[PDB]
Subunit: 116 residues, 4 copies
Amino acid sequence: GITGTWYNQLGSTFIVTAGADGALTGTAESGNAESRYVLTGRYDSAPATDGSGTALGWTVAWKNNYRNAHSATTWSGQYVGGAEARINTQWLLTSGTTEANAWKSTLVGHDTFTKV
Amino acid sequence: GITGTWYNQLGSTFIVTAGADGALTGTAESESRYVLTGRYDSAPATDGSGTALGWTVAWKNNYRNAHSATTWSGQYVGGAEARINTQWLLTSGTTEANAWKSTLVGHDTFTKV
Amino acid sequence: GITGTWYNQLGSTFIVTAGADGALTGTAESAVGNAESRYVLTGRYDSAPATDGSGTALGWTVAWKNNYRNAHSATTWSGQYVGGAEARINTQWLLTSGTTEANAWKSTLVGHDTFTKV
Amino acid sequence: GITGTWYNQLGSTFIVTAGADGALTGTAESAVGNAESRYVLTGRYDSAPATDGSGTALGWTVAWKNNYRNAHSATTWSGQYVGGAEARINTQWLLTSGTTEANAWKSTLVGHDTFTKVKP
């Protein structure tokens, strides 16, 4: 269920593969190789059967062969296989700063992913 | 720089390998050991900025499973008292109507001790 | 545009008054309107926002104690007001519970709420 | 106990008064960002905290507008007061700036502040 192509609410494209031992691997993009970055993470490979969703998280560092923004985003959330399968997340984006600007280093937000 | 053993505020031990390709792999040890994986900026600036990174632990191994995952977002700061400063989000699997309460937030500081 | 009754995705009802000197005061209550479910809110907002189409920054707090009950916690909402025909307040919130020192690492929840006029 | 002058790790000064009704009122002077002079602070606290050694839940907001400057943003602090020899308030915060819609995704910063009654 988690394996596939997912889209967030602003239209970015996340191609994710879920491995048997809890690994998440894939890529995050915009439609150019210049805008493609590697993602990696983990998920709960044996969730509960009570109806709960499946907890997961992943990271993207915003460095590829073409560009480097000196930043990384982590998404923390859960997959729900409902009428529409979705992944609901909260994220944190941290930019490299000097320690004097460290208090403003980190943004927070939320993203919903769908296969549509 | 990043590769090695790191200790957080509450005596947990993280052993991390920083790959040349930007990969972070390792373990988090608090039966208590779990895989971590993540990414870091493998070509950071040299203007005194720290190096941006993130990683994820899903809290399942061969013995236990808390149906949760934690992601840490932060940066490595090199030097005399090297540290990794982070913020984290812990998400637990909930049902639909408990989802408002699925996510904790906090912060952690890692040192080489 | 902020003064009025706002409803979040949970159905809860927030009655907010925005005063001329950036004060926000009001109540949070259940759909059902009973006294037991009513709590005080206080916060602040940008009383002279940009004219560029930007929204209006604001925040407020609710401690979940009233004369009837006490959950020993507080929620803060940080967000901005977007006006128009589909005025909304977009927020992220932190909820903190009183905890012993041992449990402080798990004292604070985070999430997001969107408020509408309808 | 909560009433007093508090300082965070960055030297900012917060002068808070806890009312018997659960109200928090006061002033903030920040050492960082787009600011100068004092700004109004308002919030709420649990005026009847548990008795089991748990902290006192609280929160407040500052909108960063005064007669001198306006940064079009507001910060909320959420946390708890821990009484004692060295009393302290441990918080997490959210800072939201007014943006347009297309920029809304990068509108909110998140952090943590620790306050003491003794200035660093």
